Design a protein around this nucleic acid. Structure first.
Ligand SMILES: [Ca+2]
Ligand SMILES: [Ca+2]
Ligand SMILES: [Ca+2]
Ligand SMILES: [Ca+2]
Ligand SMILES: [Ca+2]
Ligand SMILES: [Ca+2]
Ligand SMILES: [Ca+2]
Ligand SMILES: [Ca+2]
Ligand SMILES: [Ca+2]
Ligand SMILES: [Ca+2]
Ligand SMILES: [Ca+2]
Ligand SMILES: [Ca+2]
Ligand SMILES: [Ca+2]
Ligand SMILES: [N+]
Ligand SMILES: [N+]
Length: 388
RNA sequence: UUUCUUU
RNA sequence: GUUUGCGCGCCAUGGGCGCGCUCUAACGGGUGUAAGUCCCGAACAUGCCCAGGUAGUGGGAAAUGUAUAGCCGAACAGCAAGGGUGUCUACUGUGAGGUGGAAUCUGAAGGAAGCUGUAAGCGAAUCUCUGGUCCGACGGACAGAAAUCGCAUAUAAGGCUAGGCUUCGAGUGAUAAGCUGGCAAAGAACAGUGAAGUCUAAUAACUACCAGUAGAAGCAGAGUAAAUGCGGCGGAUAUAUGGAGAGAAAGAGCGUGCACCUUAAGCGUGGAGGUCUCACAGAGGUGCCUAGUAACAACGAACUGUGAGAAGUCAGCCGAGCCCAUAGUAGUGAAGAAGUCUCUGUAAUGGGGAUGGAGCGAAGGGGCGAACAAUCAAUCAUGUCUCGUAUUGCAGAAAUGACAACAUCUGCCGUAACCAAUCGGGUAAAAGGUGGUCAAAUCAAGCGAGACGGAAAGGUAAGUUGAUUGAACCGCCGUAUACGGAACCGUACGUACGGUGGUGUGAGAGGUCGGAAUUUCGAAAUUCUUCCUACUCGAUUGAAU
């Protein structure tokens, strides 16, 4: 019919195929490729369109098969309209042109607006817990084409459609929390509410947990769902703090996120990797660019100084270990600039790698400037350029 | 900072 | 690829068992039949202490040295026969090449059984007790294996480095195997600590000069890993292991023997296979040429025999056995070979004994290849779907009802003179506004869920036989045999033989020009890739590409 032809338009299906090419995904439960998807749509696209129009297509069984990924992408690219008009302004997750940094900025705006007390709410394992009939009556309450309802229900009995389904079922919660008058910031199944006082935050936690367990039919993980103050608040990788200058709360990378970055950096700058130090520096540059590009709305200037010093120190160990022989270490320390009468003495401390790379002649030869010329982007100046 | 040797 | 790494023979300057001769505790003394042993005497300089913070004089407790016969000779020097070099050369050859010199590297951890001088170290039967270390394979520690047990261990257990906090709190110290020094492993140096016992616990301070604490227990972290750590049992312990206690106890040097044993860079000798050169006849190309491009392959005429020559081998990884040639030759064997019989041993390789009367028997490089390990191929009712009938899970609208009582969000109270636990309470804390709430007879959208039914149709391999791949490496253990450096870690897994796990295909170039495509007719060009090559690099303890 009309909306189902809007699903199965030629430009829409070509856009879905190009988008699933850009995703570069893997095989499903049977085993095929995206170029195999291309020859599949070349030979068998009309049968797929006929089965979708005639309500006979059956899904396949985590990762979906790539023809189901393509069909789900088509359904997502038609259904991100009117739903996206209907969604809330504070639903900052799995939507076009919205990202996590906007969620953290909105949370900081509401936190500085006077609402300190946080109702963190943890919805446990959403996509299996939800009742299918309620979700399909929501979908039928916005759209009235039976065939798209049929294929989405067959998919829920069995992707890029599941984030949109999560946004529908939690858009019900957002409409309720706009009806009550609550301020909130909600990434996809990560919702935090902002209350003025702590017992009112307990009451809001109790009432919203009652509403979620009764009306949405979801399960609230009461072990992790807690009432806080914006200091023990982990949200989207960001922790929050209060400046002594009594004007603003501010975001920062939480200690779990800093620990994840430090673990990844220690894996990239491991001393015994057989790759060249240019490869370690390039992987470090990719990780540093990604970490700062996610977190740059926080304040980590001291943290970026410390992490830059630690990255440089581990790179001094990698370069000193790759030299691997005291004659070669003495030759390279003379070549980099350290005088031979001292370079031989440091090089015949060939072991004690952390001790010699901590300070001294190896600090002077492999300086900050030599590593900066080597291609190691500093965390501090990259954060300075990429901040406000 | 071992003005050393080897796997 | 690699300094060398092969076979056979010889030789001890190594070792064993005996004999002799001469020594043995600074220098001396005693005990005693006998002292090398048991015991007692003197200084001297060091170490440590008299601190109070070091540097000098006066002193004091342990310990060491001069100072046992002697051994050993550094990761210490010097000499150094020999060995290598796309290096420069003088001669010599028709040439492959061979010499003799210079330069430089090397002279090695496995036989010039290299030489000389040292620092440092060591230096006495046997027994008992004890500390430390090491071993009882390897394998992130499983499996497999002939292989000590149990637990823990990659977020990184564990160690270590630099701090922090909280409680203690200076004062005995020597002797020193070992441990640790921010981690792949081991050794050496230096530094700090330091188990076990044992010995000490004594002295007395000035002349210049410089201004609780030191230190450990405990706790949370931070940083740092090519992974082992802890405990039990058993064993080793001549780096003459740190000691302690008995011990009238042996230790060392030299010479000499043995029908004694053994050795990888010493001496003599042997090098096939392949590679290369030259000459003589053929085969060709133009009387003269035969190769080149690392080999393979290909261009071209550059191919063959035969004979004389030259350099030269010698690296476990899936290989029992066989073939080519040096070669049944050197060598070995009458001091007893092969065969035969009989005691025995190992996980496997073995070792005696008795007959016997002549055998056994190499080197390097290719080829075939049983077997092993993977991989591959060949052989050998439900459930639809189509009509139903009774239901059903979830929306929504509203005739009527009942009770006004529920849902919801801004959450403080007295104080003090003004305190958010900053004062006492309390977290559905009081005062509050906002929407009234619930049941819906019935009708009803859409996707499903399933029941009762009539109805379309439906329901071998194991084994064995082949073929391909297993290129290169990492080790480890038993016996024999040598070294650095006893142990550990190494010497190509040290090497030879015998066991045993693990990783699985570096780059360029050349070829195969197979495989894939784009262009033209699977054939030509191009790009990536499979297969072959120690030519050129890349390593070297692995691993990595
Ligand atoms: Ca080696
Ligand atoms: Ca001496
Ligand atoms: Ca061992
Ligand atoms: Ca091990
Ligand atoms: Ca640790
Ligand atoms: Ca001693
Ligand atoms: Ca030698
Ligand atoms: Ca010759
Ligand atoms: Ca092999
Ligand atoms: Ca190697
Ligand atoms: Ca070893
Ligand atoms: Ca090796
Ligand atoms: Ca060698
Ligand atoms: N070699
Ligand atoms: N090896």
């Amino acid at each position: 019919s009309n909306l189902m032809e809007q699903i199965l338009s030629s430009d829409n299906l070509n856009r879905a195929y190009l988008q699933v090419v850009r995703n570069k995904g893997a095989e499903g439960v049977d085993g095929m490729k995206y170029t195999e998807l291309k020859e599949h749509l070349a030979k068998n696209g009309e049968t797929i369109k006929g089965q979708l129009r005639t309500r006979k297509y059956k899904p396949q069984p985590g990762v979906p098969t790539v023809t189901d990924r393509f069909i789900q992408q088509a359904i997502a690219q038609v259904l991100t309209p009117i739903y996206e008009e209907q969604f809330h302004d504070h639903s900052y997750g799995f939507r076009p042109n919205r990202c996590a940094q906007q969620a953290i900025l909105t949370a900081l705006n509401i936190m500085n607006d006077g609402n300190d007390w946080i109702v963190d709410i943890d919805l446990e394992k959403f996509f299996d817990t939800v009742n299918h009939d309620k979700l399909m009556t929501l979908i039928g309450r916005t759209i009235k084409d039976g065939d798209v309802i049929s294929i989405v229900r067959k998919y829920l009995v069995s992707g890029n459609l599941s984030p949109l389904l999560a946004n529908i079922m939690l858009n019900e919660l957002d409409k309720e929390m706009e009806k009550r008058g609550l301020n909130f910031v909600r990434y996809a199944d990560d919702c935090i509410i902002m209350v003025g006082s702590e017992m009112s935050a307990n009451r809001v936690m109790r009432n919203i947990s009652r509403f979620i367990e009764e009306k949405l039919g979801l399960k609230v993980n009461m072990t992790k769902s807690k009432v806080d103050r914006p200091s023990g608040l982990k949200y989207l990788g960001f922790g929050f703090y209060f400046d002594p200058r009594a004007h603003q709360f501010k975001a920062k990378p939480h200690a779990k996120s800093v620990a994840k970055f430090k673990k990844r950096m220690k894996e990239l700058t491991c001393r015994s990797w057989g790759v060249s130090n240019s490869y370690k520096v390039e992987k470090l540059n990719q990780l540093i660019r990604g970490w700062i590009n996610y977190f740059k709305i926080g304040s980590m200037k001291t943290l970026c100084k410390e992490l830059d010093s630690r990255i440089r120190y581990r790179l001094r160990m990698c370069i000193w270990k790759q030299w691997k022989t005291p004659q070669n270490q003495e030759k390279n320390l003379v070549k980099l600039g350290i005088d031979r009468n001292t370079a031989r003495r440091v090089a015949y401390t060939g072991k004690r790698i952390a001790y010699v790379c901590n300070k001294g002649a190896v600090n002077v030869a492999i300086s900050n400037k030599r590593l900066a010329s080597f291609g190691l982007i500093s965390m501090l100046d990259y954060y300075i350029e990429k901040c406000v």
